Amino acid sequence: SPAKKKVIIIGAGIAGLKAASTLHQNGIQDCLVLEARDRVGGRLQTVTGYQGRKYDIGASWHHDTLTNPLFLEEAQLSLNDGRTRFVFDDDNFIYIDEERGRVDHDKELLLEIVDNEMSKFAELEFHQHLGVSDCSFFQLVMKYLLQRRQFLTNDQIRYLPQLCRYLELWHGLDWKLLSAKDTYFGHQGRNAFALNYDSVVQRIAQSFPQNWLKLSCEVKSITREPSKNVTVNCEDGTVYNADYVIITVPQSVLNLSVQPEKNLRGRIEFQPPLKPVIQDAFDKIHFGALGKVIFEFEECCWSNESSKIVTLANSTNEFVEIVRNAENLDELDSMLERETSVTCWSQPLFFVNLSKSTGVASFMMLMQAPLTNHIESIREDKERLFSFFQPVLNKIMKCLDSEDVIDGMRANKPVLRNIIVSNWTRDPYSRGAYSACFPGDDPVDMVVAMSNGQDSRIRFAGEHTIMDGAGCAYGAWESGRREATRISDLLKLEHHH
Amino acid sequence: KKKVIIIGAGIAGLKAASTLHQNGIQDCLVLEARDRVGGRLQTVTGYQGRKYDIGASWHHDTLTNPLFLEEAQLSLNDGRTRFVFDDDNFIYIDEERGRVDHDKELLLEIVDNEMSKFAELEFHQHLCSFFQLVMKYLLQRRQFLTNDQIRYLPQLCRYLELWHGLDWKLLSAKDTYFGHQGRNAFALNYDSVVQRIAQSFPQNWLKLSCEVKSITREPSKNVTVNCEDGTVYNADYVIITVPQSVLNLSVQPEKNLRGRIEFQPPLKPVIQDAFDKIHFGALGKVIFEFEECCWSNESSKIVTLANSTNEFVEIVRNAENLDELDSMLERETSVTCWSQPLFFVNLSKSTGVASFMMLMQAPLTNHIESIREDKERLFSFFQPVLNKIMKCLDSEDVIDGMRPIENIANANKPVLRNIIVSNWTRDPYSRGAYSACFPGDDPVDMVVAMSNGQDSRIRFAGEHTIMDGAGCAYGAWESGRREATRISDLLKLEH
Ligand SMILES: Cc1cc2nc3c(=O)[nH]c(=O)nc-3n(C[C@H](O)[C@H](O)[C@H](O)COP(=O)(O)OP(=O)(O)OC[C@H]3O[C@@H](n4cnc5c(N)ncnc54)[C@H](O)[C@@H]3O)c2cc1C
Numbered sequence: 001s002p003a004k005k006k007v008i009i010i011g012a013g014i015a016g017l018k019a020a021s022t023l024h025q026n027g028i029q030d031c032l033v034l035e036a037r038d039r040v041g042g043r044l045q046t047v048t049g050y051q052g053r054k055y056d057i058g059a060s061w062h063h064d065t066l067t068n069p070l071f072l073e074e075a076q077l078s079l080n081d082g083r084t085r086f087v088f089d090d091d092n093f094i095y096i097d098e099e100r101g102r103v104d105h106d107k108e109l110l111l112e113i114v115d116n117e118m119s120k121f122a123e124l125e126f127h128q129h130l131g132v133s134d135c136s137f138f139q140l141v142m143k144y145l146l147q148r149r150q151f152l153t154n155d156q157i158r159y160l161p162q163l164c165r166y167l168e169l170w171h172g173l174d175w176k177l178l179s180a181k182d183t184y185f186g187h188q189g190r191n192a193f194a195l196n197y198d199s200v201v202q203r204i205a206q207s208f209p210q211n212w213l214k215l216s217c218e219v220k221s222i223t224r225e226p227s228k229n230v231t232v233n234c235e236d237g238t239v240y241n242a243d244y245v246i247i248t249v250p251q252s253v254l255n256l257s258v259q260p261e262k263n264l265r266g267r268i269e270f271q272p273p274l275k276p277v278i279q280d281a282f283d284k285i286h287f288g289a290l291g292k293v294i295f296e297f298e299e300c301c302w303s304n305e306s307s308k309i310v311t312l313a314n315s316t317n318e319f320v321e322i323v324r325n326a327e328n329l330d331e332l333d334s335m336l337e338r339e340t341s342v343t344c345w346s347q348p349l350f351f352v353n354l355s356k357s358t359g360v361a362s363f364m365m366l367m368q369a370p371l372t373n374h375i376e377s378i379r380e381d382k383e384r385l386f387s388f389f390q391p392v393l394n395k396i397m398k399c400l401d402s403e404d405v406i407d408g409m410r411a412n413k414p415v416l417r418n419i420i421v422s423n424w425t426r427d428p429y430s431r432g433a434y435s436a437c438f439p440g441d442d443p444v445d446m447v448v449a450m451s452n453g454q455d456s457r458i459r460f461a462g463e464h465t466i467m468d469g470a471g472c473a474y475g476a477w478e479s480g481r482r483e484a485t486r487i488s489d490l491l492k493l494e495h496h497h
Numbered sequence: 498k499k500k501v502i503i504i505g506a507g508i509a510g511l512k513a514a515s516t517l518h519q520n521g522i523q524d525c526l527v528l529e530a531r532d533r534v535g536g537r538l539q540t541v542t543g544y545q546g547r548k549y550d551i552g553a554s555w556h557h558d559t560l561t562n563p564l565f566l567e568e569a570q571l572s573l574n575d576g577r578t579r580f581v582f583d584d585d586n587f588i589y590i591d592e593e594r595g596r597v598d599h600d601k602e603l604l605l606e607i608v609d610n611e612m613s614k615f616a617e618l619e620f621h622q623h624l625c626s627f628f629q630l631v632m633k634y635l636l637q638r639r640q641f642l643t644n645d646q647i648r649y650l651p652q653l654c655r656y657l658e659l660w661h662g663l664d665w666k667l668l669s670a671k672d673t674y675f676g677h678q679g680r681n682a683f684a685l686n687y688d689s690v691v692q693r694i695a696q697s698f699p700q701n702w703l704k705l706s707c708e709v710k711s712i713t714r715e716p717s718k719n720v721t722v723n724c725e726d727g728t729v730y731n732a733d734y735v736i737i738t739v740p741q742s743v744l745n746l747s748v749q750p751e752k753n754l755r756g757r758i759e760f761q762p763p764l765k766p767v768i769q770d771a772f773d774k775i776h777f778g779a780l781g782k783v784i785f786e787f788e789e790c791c792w793s794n795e796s797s798k799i800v801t802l803a804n805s806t807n808e809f810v811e812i813v814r815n816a817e818n819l820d821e822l823d824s825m826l827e828r829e830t831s832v833t834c835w836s837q838p839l840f841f842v843n844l845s846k847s848t849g850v851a852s853f854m855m856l857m858q859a860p861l862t863n864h865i866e867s868i869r870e871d872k873e874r875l876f877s878f879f880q881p882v883l884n885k886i887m888k889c890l891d892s893e894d895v896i897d898g899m900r901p902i903e904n905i906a907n908a909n910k911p912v913l914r915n916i917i918v919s920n921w922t923r924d925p926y927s928r929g930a931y932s933a934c935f936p937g938d939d940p941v942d943m944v945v946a947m948s949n950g951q952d953s954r955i956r957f958a959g960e961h962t963i964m965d966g967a968g969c970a971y972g973a974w975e976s977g978r979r980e981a982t983r984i985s986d987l988l989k990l991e992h
C-alpha cells in the first residue's frame with residue numbers, strides 16, 4: 001500500500017533540492033521530495049512589494065565567492081549566457097551616529113583602522129588556543145578597549161565598540177549573546193548580491209523529475225523498519241516506504257523532536273528517537289535571528305555614495321570615562337551594570353542601499369536578535385513600524401543629502417510607499433534565521449552528529465549539517481550534494497555482478 | 498679576560514649587552530665596525546635641524562612588540578612623547594587619473610583585500626613571484642573585475658613592495674602577504690631608543706671602529722676574535738649580531754671584503770646552506786624637507802601608482818591562460834619616478850615637520866642611492882611625482898630651493914630645501930636594508946640555524962635570527978635579549 005521510493009528527501013530548501021538534483025544526476029530513479037510549505041526554496045524566498053519590485057527576504061548574497069561552489073556554478077552560467085544573475089555590491093561602509101553623523105573613513109577617528117586591530121586582537125585571543133574559555137563578543141570588545149586604552153582617543157573608545165557591532169548582523173545575535181570565539185571569521189572573497197535567489201532555487205528545482213516534488217505535505221513521523229527500511233508519514237495521512245531518507249528540516253525544527261507534544265507544527269516523531277549524541281549536540285549550538293525590513297520608496301531621491309550603510313547604536317562619554325577609570329577587567333564588567341525602552345538607536349542597524357546596487361529605490365535593512373522577534377512580531381502594524389524606524393530613516397537621509405522622510409504608504413522629498421518585514425522567527429517551519437553560536441558553543445558538535453546521521457538510512461543535510469559554509473546557503477547546497485552522493489554510492493553496489 | 502664579547506652595536510648587540518649587565522655580568526666587550534652604534538637604526542639631521550629615522554622608523558605589531566611595550570611603559574610613566582600612531586587611510590595617486598583611493602566605483606581597496614585572501618588560499622597547505630600571483634588572480638577573477646579595477650588594482654597592491662624592499666617580479670609570492678599584528682607606531686626618533694639601551698650598560702664596554710675580521714674558537718674553551726687593525730680579545734661566549742648580508746660574505750673567496758668575518762673552523766653546513774634562500778631586500782629612503790607646511794594634511798600616508806595602461810586590461814580580457822597572458826605581457830626603457838610605486842609618509846600630519854619621508858625599493862633604491870650626492874638629479878627624478886602629490890593635496894608645483902634665492906612669490910607655493918637619501922645598499926656594514934624573500938626562499942632554516950648558533954660559545958642575534966618580528970626592530974632587540982639571558986643563566990649557574 002505505502003508507496004515504494006528509493007530516497008525520500010524531507011524539505012524543499014536549497015539542501016533537499018540539491019539532494020534531489022544530485023540524485024537525478026546520478027540516475028537514481030523513483031525519488032520523492034516532501035515539503036510542508038506550498039513553495040520550494042524554504043529560507044530562500046523572494047517576495048514582491050510596491051510596483052512589483054522584488055527582494056530576497058531570506059538569503060541575499062553568495063558569500064566566499066572565491067570558493068563558493070554554488071556561486072561558481074551560477075557564475076559559469078552567466079559567463080556562458082551573458083545573463084546577469086548577481087552583482088558584487090560590496091562597497092565602503094558609511095557609518096552614521098545619531099549625534100555626530102558620519103564617522104566613517106574619518107581623518108581623526110580612523111574607526112575602521114582600529115576595528116582591524118580590534119579584529120587582530122580577537123584573533124590573537126583565540127586562533128590556535130586550547131583551553132581559552134569563551135565570553136561574549138561584548139566582553140571581548142571591552143577587554144580590547146581596556147588593554148589598549150593608552151592608544152585610543154576618547155572618541156575612539158566611545159564610537160569604536162558601536163561600529164564594531166556591525167558584526168551582530170552577520171551572526172544575527174546581539175553582542176551580549178554572541179560568542180566571541182566565533183564572532184570573527186574570514187571571508188573567502190567579496191560577496192555577490194543575488195539578483196533573484198529564487199532564480200537559483202528554480203534552476204535546481206527544474207533539474208529533476210517534476211513529479212518527485214510533492215508540496216504541502218508536513219511530515220509527522222519517520223520510522224526505521226527493523227527490515228532496513230524507513231517509513232515516512234505526511235499529516236494528510238499518505239504513507240511512504242523508502243530505502244534512504246535525507247532530512248533537511250531546520251536545526252530549530254529538528255530540535256522539536258527532543259521534546260513531548262507531537263502537535264507542534266513542523267516536528268517529526270523519530271522511531272527509534274534521535275541518537276543521544278544528536279539531541280545533546282543541540283545544547284552546544286543555537287539559533288540566530290537575522291531579520292530584514294524592506295523600505296520601499298517612490299523614487300531614488302538620495303545620494304548613492306555607497307550601498308552599505310550601518311547606523312551605530314548610542315554611546316555615552318560616561319562610558320569613555322568608565323573605561324578611563326576601571327582599575328581591572330572585572331571592575332569594568334561590574335561597574336557598567338549601572339541601571340529603558342528599545343528604539344531604532346538601541347542597537348546597530350545594517351542598511352543596504354539598493355539604489356546604487358540594483359537601481360531600485362528601496363532600503364534592505366538587517367536586524368538582529370532581540371530586535372528581530374520584536375519587529376517581526378509586529379510586522380503587521382505598518383504604522384507602528386514606520387514610527388519606530390523614522391528617526392534612523394531620517395538621519396540616514398539627512399546624511400545622504402536628502403530631507404526627512406514622508407510616510408506615503410496609504411516633490412524632492414523621500415516618500416516611504418511600502419514596508420516589508422521578514423517572518424522567519426514566527427514561521428513554524430523556519431523558527432529563526434539560521435545556526436549561530438552562543439558563548440561556550442562547540443558548533444563542531446552538531447556538524448559531526450548531523451553529518452554522521454541517525455543511522456545507515458536516516459541522514460541529514462542542511463546549513464547545520466556541514467562545516468564549510470555552515471549557516472550559508474552554499475553550505476546547505478553542499479550538504480545536499482553530500483548526502484545524496486553517499487546514497488548514490490551505496491546504491492552503486494546494486495549493479496555489481 | 499672578558500665574559501661575553503658582543504659583535505655589533507646594533508639594536509641586537511645593544512640589548513644583548515644591556516641584558517647581560519642587567520643580569521650582573523661583568524667584563525664585557527661590544528665591538529662595532531662603525532664609529533657609531535645604532536646600526537640600521539640611524540637618525541640624521543637635515544634642514545632647520547630636523548631629525549629623521551633614515552633607517553628603522555616604525556614600531557610594528559604594537560600588540561605583541563615587546564620593545565614597543567617597554568617604550569609605552571616609560572610614556573605612561575614620565576608622560577613624554579616617544580611615538581605617534583600614524584596608520585592613516587592611504588591615499589593612492591595615479592599620474593593620469595589622480596586619486597583612486599576610497600573610490601565609489603573603483604573600490605580598489607576592497608578588491609586588494611580579495612587579492613590577499615586569494616593569495617592566502619593559493620598557499621594554504623602547499624608543498625612564483627608576487628607579480629605571477631597578481632596575474633593569476635586577475636586572470637582567474639577577471640569575470641568579476643571591471644576594466645579599471647583590472648588596470649589599477651595590480652599597481653595599487655604593489656605598495657607591498659615597500660614592505661619587502663623588492664619589486665613584484667623579484668619578491669616571493671608565498672611571503673608577500675604576511676599579516677600585521679596591530680597598528681604601527683611611528684617612533685619619534687628611534688635613536689632615543691638606541692640611546693636608552695646604549696646607556697644601560699657601562700660605556701667602557703663599547704669598542705667603536707672595530708672591524709672584527711675573524712672569529713676563532715680555541716680548543717681550550719675560549720673564544721678569541723681580532724679586529725681589522727689589530728686588537729685581539731677573548732671571551733667565554735660571543736654574541737655575533739652582524740647583519741645577515743655581511744655574514745653571507747663569510748662564505749666567499751678573497752676573504753677581505755669589508756666587514757667579512759672569517760671563522761675557524763668555518764660556519765657549519767646547516768648555516769652555509771641557509772644562504773641559498775635569498776635575503777637581498779633593499780628598502781631605501783629619501784626625505785624631502787620643505788620650507789613650511791602648505792599642502793592638505795588629509796592623510797599621513799600616500800603612494801604614487803606606477804603608470805598603468807589600457808592595453809593591459811585588453812590583454813587580461815583576451816588571454817586564454819596563464820601561459821598566453823604571460824608571454825603576451827612583454828614588448829617595448831627609461832626608469833622614471835613613475836616606473837614603480839612610491840610610498841610617501843607625510844610627516845606634516847603626524848609630526849608637524851614640513852617633510853616627506855619616502856620609501857623606495859629594489860632595483861630603484863640601489864640607483865637613487867648611488868646618486869645620493871647629486872641633489873639636482875634627485876630633484877628631477879622625483880619632481881613629477883612630487884608635483885602630482887602636491888596637486889592632489891590642494892597645493893601646487895614644487896619650487897626648487899636647494900640653492901636658495903628668497904622671493905616673496907613663494908607665498909602659498911611649497912619650497913623644497915633639502916633632500917636626504919639613504920645609503921644602506923652601499924654601506925659595507927649593511928649591503929642592503931633587511932631580509933626579504935626571492936621566489937623560492939624559506940624564512941625558517943635560517944632563523945633556526947642562526948638561533949642554534951655555531952656551538953655553545955658562538956651565538957647569533959639580529960633581525961635574521963628570530964621568527965617573531967623577523968627582520969623587524971623589536972625582533973632583533975629580542976634576539977639580543979635572547980642570546981644574553983641564555984648566557985647570563987649559564988655563567989650564573991657556574992657555581
Ligand atoms: C533572513 C535570512 C537571511 C540570510 N541571508 C543569507 C545570505 O545572505 N547568504 C547565505 O549564504 N545564506 C543566508 N541565509 C541562510 C540560508 O538562507 C540558509 O542557510 C539556507 O537557506 C538553508 O537551506 P536548508 O535547505 O538547509 O534549510 P531551509 O531553506 O529552511 O529548508 C528546510 C525545509 O524544511 C521544510 N520543512 C520543515 N519541516 C518540515 C516537515 N516536517 N515536513 C515537510 N517539510 C518541512 C521547510 O518548509 C523548508 O522548506 C539567510 C537566512 C535567513 C533566515
Ligand SMILES: Cc1cc2nc3c(=O)[nH]c(=O)nc-3n(C[C@H](O)[C@H](O)[C@H](O)COP(=O)(O)OP(=O)(O)OC[C@H]3O[C@@H](n4cnc5c(N)ncnc54)[C@H](O)[C@@H]3O)c2cc1C
Nearest residue numbers: 505507508509530536537553554555709926959960970973
Ligand atoms: C631603510 C630601513 C628602514 C627600516 N624600517 C623599519 C621599521 O620601520 N620598523 C622595524 O621594525 N624595522 C625596520 N627596519 C629594519 C630594522 O631597522 C633592522 O632589522 C634592525 O635595525 C636590525 O638591528 P640589528 O642589531 O639586528 O642589525 P644592525 O642594526 O645592522 O646591527 C649590526 C651591527 O653590526 C655591525 N657590523 C657589521 N659588520 C661588522 C664587523 N665585521 N665587525 C664589527 N661590527 C660589524 C654593523 O655596523 C651594525 O652596527 C628598517 C631597515 C632599513 C634598512
Ligand SMILES: C[C@H](CCNCCCCN)NC(=O)c1ccccc1
Nearest residue numbers: 557659660661675966967968969970
Ligand atoms: C619594519 C617594516 C618592514 C617589514 N618587516 C618584516 C618583518 C615582519 C615579518 N614577520 N617596515 C616597513 O617596511 C614598512 C614601511 C611602511 C609601512 C609599514 C611598514
